[PDB]
Structure 1
Amino acid sequence: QSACTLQSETHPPLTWQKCSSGGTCTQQTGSVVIDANWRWTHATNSSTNCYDGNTWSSTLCPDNETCAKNCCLDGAAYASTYGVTTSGNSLSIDFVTQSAQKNVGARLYLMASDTTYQEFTLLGNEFSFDVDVSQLPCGLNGALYFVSMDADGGVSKYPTNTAGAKYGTGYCDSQCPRDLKFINGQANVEGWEPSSNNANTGIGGHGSCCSEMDIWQANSISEALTPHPCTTVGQEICEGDGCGGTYSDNRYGGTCDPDGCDWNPYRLGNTSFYGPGSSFTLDTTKKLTVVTQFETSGAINRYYVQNGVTFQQPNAELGSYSGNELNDDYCTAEEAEFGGSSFSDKGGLTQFKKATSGGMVLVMSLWDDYYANMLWLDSTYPTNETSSTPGAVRGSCSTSSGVPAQVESQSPNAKVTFSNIKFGPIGSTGNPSG
């Protein structure tokens, strides 16, 4: 897709800190950009939409190539249309924003410049951030994660994509998403099937795959940490159901691991660690700090801080495994206890290390789940399972929770605030910010 300028594109600024082993942190200045799917897509020569509701213009978009040549992405009114605002080192995303139309959440990427994404090399380093999830009830997900996206949004690889990172193009994740309107410089109109429950979405013939590191997927009820390996580390197109993931009939028939080696304290047995109120170790009605460390062995460590008290990731006992570190033994024990084999089939942490060794783009999003109602995160899943089934219970939410139309109507004012992002070598982010 090309870029049009009927509406100006001004990326909201966002500062963060880069720390060093020497014990000092320095301020960096970046900005955020909204994903291309949220934008107005219209003809390059007029204001006629190329996409409207959940269908494509059959004349402007008869096929993937022609559509890309005829259509462009336009600017976004961040605050008024998408409920996205920033202030210093803080970013807030509103759940439902009402303007000309109704908008639900957002997916944003951290930029290095106005035209490029900021790339982070996680291996050997640690990432820290403060988060307020108090306004996120059952069914919602305020996420912060990394994906192996190209710094330019794919422009250098795909000439027909001239909009680039400035317009939030190039997304990919372990689900090999097929809902993306533009992939590899082309539209995703061929094989397009409109969603039955979402008036704005559909599923196309192609998907976009890549490694994904889910640092944080959570609400006030549950939280999970999950690495997802893929046989191909970076962004790669996929065909139909061979994509696997949430958008295909076969979830595990692809090149990426859509499940990952997840670590949810509640799912692991500690139902008193994270939740709303003082009866939990970490009170989700208050802001907290989340620190994730990527050691060179490929293992991942985690600790939290609230009101100046530090808590390491709670110990878990699963099969022959015991400890609080996400390593090869944990992931193997999890597959043995909870079942499944996609993580190991995709290479596990060894394959995943290839992603963290390279650059990864930071993503912050707020969304509700039109496919599984977020039950996999905060309820019992599958819903027909009982508490006696290992790993079925992931949270205290009712199995009837998370219906999009319902949560959007009942909790429109929900929101998430991410702030004070700090990145640097292991053991450095806890030091004084510059």
Structure 2
Amino acid sequence: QQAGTNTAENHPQLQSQQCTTSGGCKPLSTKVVLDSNWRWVHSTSGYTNCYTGNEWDTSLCPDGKTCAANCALDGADYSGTYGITSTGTALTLKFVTGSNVGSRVYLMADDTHYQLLKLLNQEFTFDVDMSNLPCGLNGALYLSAMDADGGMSKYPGNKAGAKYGTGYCDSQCPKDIKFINGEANVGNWTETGSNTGTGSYGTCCSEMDIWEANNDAAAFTPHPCTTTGQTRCSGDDCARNTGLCDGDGCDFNSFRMGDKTFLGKGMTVDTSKPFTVVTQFLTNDNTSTGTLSEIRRIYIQNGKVIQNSVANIPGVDPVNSITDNFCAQQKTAFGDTNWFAQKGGLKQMGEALGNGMVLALSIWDDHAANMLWLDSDYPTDKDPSAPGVARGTCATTSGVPSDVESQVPNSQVVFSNIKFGDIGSTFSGTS
């Protein structure tokens, strides 16, 4: 895609903190940028759209290379069009704004580069307010193995780059991404909704889901891919699980793991109020070159340090962190193939972490599975009493996009106090 000039692109500021054991925490002047899928795309020499609703203009876009040459991504009115605001330390992402549904933004080091976080033998910490984030919605904070420049160095047809939010990829190898590898994804374009479609290519990469949640359920999930970095796929390589990527991931959702009273409204972690979420990425030898061996989770709310809940599933050791062994155990228990281990398990997740990953923050609804996988029974054809089926208490009928968008359009999530650095250094304790 080209870089448009009709609307100035001004990235909201979202300060973060980098922390070290000896030095404490220091501010970084990071920013956020809207993902390229949500943007206006128009002819480079004017105002005519290249994409409207759920279709491309085939005159401007007869093939992916010609489309990318002819079409430009432009600047965004963050609050007015997308319902995205920042105080400079707290990011509010509103659900419906006019005809726009949801958003995804990336954390930037500067106006042309995503922040590349290297979190081996490090931790990541943030505050979240899900008070107004219900069943069917997902306020997600996560890592993708994207390039810091959004792909510009690799793909001559991408002249827009990180400044315009290009180069997404994730463990689901999505085929709804409009620009991949510098080409518009227009081949065999198929409508999937009023504003969305899919093309013949998907875009794959390893993903660490630090946080997928609403006030009914939360999950943290590594998803390794056998490939390294952002990879365009065709055919069954795009196929979830069986292709390049573990689409399912090794998840730790307290409720799915057999503890139905840890996290939710009025629970130990009270989702009706803000709280702090710490995620630590331990290596087997406590070094940054070591092998990712454990992902630990600690919560803080009202100054109380809250350790993660323990698993309570027959056949699964009663642990409260993600490990290779916990993954093998919960996949057998749940009847899920260990696509995670097949792709290289925590070791492979860890090398993606070591190579550097981009932070995404988002609010969305789920046209495919209605968020049931997060907060209800899934699959919708399995017995809810079976281990792993039930992931929350949302109704099996909730989360249909058309219902949530009219009933709770002013839902939002707030992400704030973003910190990363040495293990134990982004937060403190005392007696």
- TM (norm. structure 2) is 0.96
Determine the C-alpha separation between the residues in 1 that align with 2:27 and 2:414.
19
> What amino acid maps onto 1:252 in structure 2?
N
User: Of the candidates 317, 320, 323, which is equivalent to residue 321 of structure 1?
Assistant: 317
1:57 aligns with 57
Within a 5 Å distance, the mapping from 1:224-243 to structure 2 comes to 224-243=219-238
Say whether the 8 Å CA contact 1:24–1:431 is kept in structure 2: no
User: In the TM superposition, what is the alpha-carbon distance from 1:431 to its structure 2 partner?
Assistant: 4.3
Determine the C-alpha separation between the residues in 2 that align with 1:80 and 1:322.
48
Determine the C-alpha separation between the residues in 2 that align with 1:260 and 1:351.
12
Q: Determine helix, strand or coil for the equivalent of 2:348.
A: helix
Determine the C-alpha separation between the residues in 2 that align with 1:331 and 1:294.
15
User: In the TM superposition, what is the alpha-carbon distance from 1:322 to its structure 2 partner?
Assistant: 2.3
2:257 aligns with 268
Determine the C-alpha separation between the residues in 2 that align with 1:259 and 1:384.
17
Say whether the 8 Å CA contact 2:316–2:330 is kept in structure 1: no
Say whether the 8 Å CA contact 1:208–1:237 is kept in structure 2: yes
Structure 2 residue 328 is the aligned partner of structure 1 residue 335: no
User: In the TM superposition, what is the alpha-carbon distance from 1:276 to its structure 2 partner?
Assistant: 1.0
Residue by residue over 1:30-77, the C-alpha shift from the partner in whole angstroms, topping out at 9 and shown as x without a partner, is 110000010010111121111111111111111111111111111100
Determine the C-alpha separation between the residues in 2 that align with 1:272 and 1:399.
19
Structure 2 residue 214 is the aligned partner of structure 1 residue 219: yes
Determine the C-alpha separation between the residues in 2 that align with 1:134 and 1:384.
31
> What amino acid maps onto 2:76 in structure 1?
A
2:114 aligns with 117
Unaligned runs of at least 5 residues, structure 2: 285-291
> What amino acid maps onto 2:85 in structure 1?
T
Determine the C-alpha separation between the residues in 2 that align with 1:357 and 1:45.
41
Say whether the 8 Å CA contact 1:92–1:418 is kept in structure 2: yes
Say whether the 8 Å CA contact 1:230–1:257 is kept in structure 2: yes
- TM (norm. structure 1) is 0.95
1:291 aligns with 278
Determine the C-alpha separation between the residues in 1 that align with 2:319 and 2:134.
30
Q: Determine helix, strand or coil for the equivalent of 2:65.
A: helix
> What amino acid maps onto 1:396 in structure 2?
T
Residue by residue over 1:105-161, the C-alpha shift from the partner in whole angstroms, topping out at 9 and shown as x without a partner, is 100000011111100001000010000011111100000000111010100000110
Determine the C-alpha separation between the residues in 2 that align with 1:191 and 1:313.
45
Say whether the 8 Å CA contact 1:32–1:108 is kept in structure 2: yes
2:22 aligns with 22
2:288 aligns with none
Residue by residue over 1:317-352, the C-alpha shift from the partner in whole angstroms, topping out at 9 and shown as x without a partner, is 441422112111100001110122211211111111
Say whether the 8 Å CA contact 1:150–1:170 is kept in structure 2: yes
Say whether the 8 Å CA contact 1:220–1:276 is kept in structure 2: yes
1:393 aligns with 390
Say whether the 8 Å CA contact 1:25–1:431 is kept in structure 2: no
Determine the C-alpha separation between the residues in 1 that align with 2:141 and 2:151.
22
Say whether the 8 Å CA contact 1:143–1:364 is kept in structure 2: yes
1:48 aligns with 48
2:181 aligns with 184
Q: Determine helix, strand or coil for the equivalent of 1:321.
A: coil
Determine the C-alpha separation between the residues in 1 that align with 2:47 and 2:194.
21
User: In the TM superposition, what is the alpha-carbon distance from 1:384 to its structure 2 partner?
Assistant: 2.5
Q: Determine helix, strand or coil for the equivalent of 1:65.
A: helix
Determine the C-alpha separation between the residues in 1 that align with 2:197 and 2:384.
34
Say whether the 8 Å CA contact 2:200–2:234 is kept in structure 1: yes
The root-mean-square deviation of aligned C-alpha atoms, in Å, is 1.1
Within a 5 Å distance, the mapping from 1:132-211 to structure 2 comes to 132-195=129-192, 198-211=193-206
Determine the C-alpha separation between the residues in 2 that align with 1:309 and 1:242.
46
1:247 aligns with none
What number of residue pairs does the alignment pair up? 419
1:89 aligns with 89
Say whether the 8 Å CA contact 1:23–1:431 is kept in structure 2: no
More deviation in 342-351 or 406-415?
342-351
Q: Determine helix, strand or coil for the equivalent of 1:364.
A: strand
Say whether the 8 Å CA contact 2:12–2:88 is kept in structure 1: no
User: Of the candidates 294, 304, 310, which is equivalent to residue 305 of structure 2?
Assistant: 310
Residue by residue over 1:194-215, the C-alpha shift from the partner in whole angstroms, topping out at 9 and shown as x without a partner, is 11xx200001000111110000
User: In the TM superposition, what is the alpha-carbon distance from 1:23 to its structure 2 partner?
Assistant: 4.5
